[PDB]
């Protein structure tokens, strides 16, 4: 996350931190995800497409630090790793960038809600908030494009939904963005998602509820003028999510 503020998992209790075993070389962070039910985390296919073996991956819930354990964290194995059969990346755009992980503890239980772990609601079919709406994104991604290290404490920031009309100005992304994506950015271009934040939640209030409206997917650079973050548009994937779940 570029800009925004350091937060803690209690403020984003549906955030899932996904790691890979080595191999190796022990264990390194992969990407963020979101808890959408006790047994299921949703994330982005591009995070896993290179190493698609569920046995490599660990999922933590209730965790606020990248390389240190947090009181109230729980560790999970990945029982099923489900990637989108239609994932494609062009130059910079990722299409169908959505993935499902079925989680299970060694014991072998799904998640229990607690002050650090809660599920996040999915939107109803084709329900998205209005453009201009303020949403939150969260993650352990880079704090600057040029950094080589990742923050050790979870960050969040607030970005605003942009209309498709506007995002598909050539001046923005043009044709690279599809009705299967949403755009969101800072009106002053100083806060954004960055590498390491992929798979994480774009969360909005939408008719009563904190909702998973997007998954962090792609963009040109991070926090660059007229280059918003692009998110996978969850409300256009309900059937995908229902069948594979």
């Amino acid at each position: 996350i570029i800009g925004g503020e350091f937060t803690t998992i209690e403020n984003q209790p549906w955030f899932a931190a996904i790691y890979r075993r080595h191999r190796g070389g022990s264990v390194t962070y992969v990407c963020g995800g979101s808890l959408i039910s006790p047994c299921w985390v949703i994330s982005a296919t591009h995070c896993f497409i290179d190493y698609p073996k569920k046995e490599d991956y660990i999922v933590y819930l209730g965790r606020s630090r990248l390389n240190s354990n947090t009181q109230g964290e729980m560790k999970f194995e990945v029982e099923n790793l489900i990637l989108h059969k239609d994932y494609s990346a062009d130059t910079l755009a990722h299409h169908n960038d959505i993935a499902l992980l079925k989680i299970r503890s060694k014991e072998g239980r799904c998640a229990q809600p607690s002050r650090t772990i809660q599920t996040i609601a999915l939107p109803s079919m084709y329900n998205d908030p209005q453009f201009g709406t303020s949403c939150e994104i969260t993650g352990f991604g880079k704090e600057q494009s040029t950094d080589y290290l990742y923050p050790e404490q979870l960050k969040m920031t607030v970005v605003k939904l942009i209309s498709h009309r506007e995002c598909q100005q050539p001046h923005y992304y043009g044709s690279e963005v599809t009705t299967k994506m949403l755009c969101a950015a800072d009106p002053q271009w100083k806060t954004d998602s960055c590498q390491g934040d992929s798979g994480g939640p774009l969360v909005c209030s939408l008719q009563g509820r904190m909702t998973l409206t997007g998954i962090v997917s792609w963009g040109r650079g991070c926090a660059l003028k007229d280059k918003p973050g692009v998110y996978t548009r969850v409300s256009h994937f309900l059937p995908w999510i229902r069948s594979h779940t």
């Binding site: 080595h22 190796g24 070389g25 390194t28 962070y29 992969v30 990407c31 591009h46 995070c47 497409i49 290179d50 190493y51 990346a89 990722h94 991604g141 494009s145 990742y150 998602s193 960055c194 590498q195 390491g196 934040d197 992929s198 798979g199 792609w218 963009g219 040109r220 650079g221 991070c222 973050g229």
Partner: peptide, 16 residues
């Protein structure tokens, strides 16, 4: 695929 322990190797970034 590289060889790497690289975080989010196809994220906004980033070689791929």
């Amino acid at each position: 695929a590289c060889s790497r322990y690289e975080v989010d190797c196809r994220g906004r970034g980033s070689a791929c």
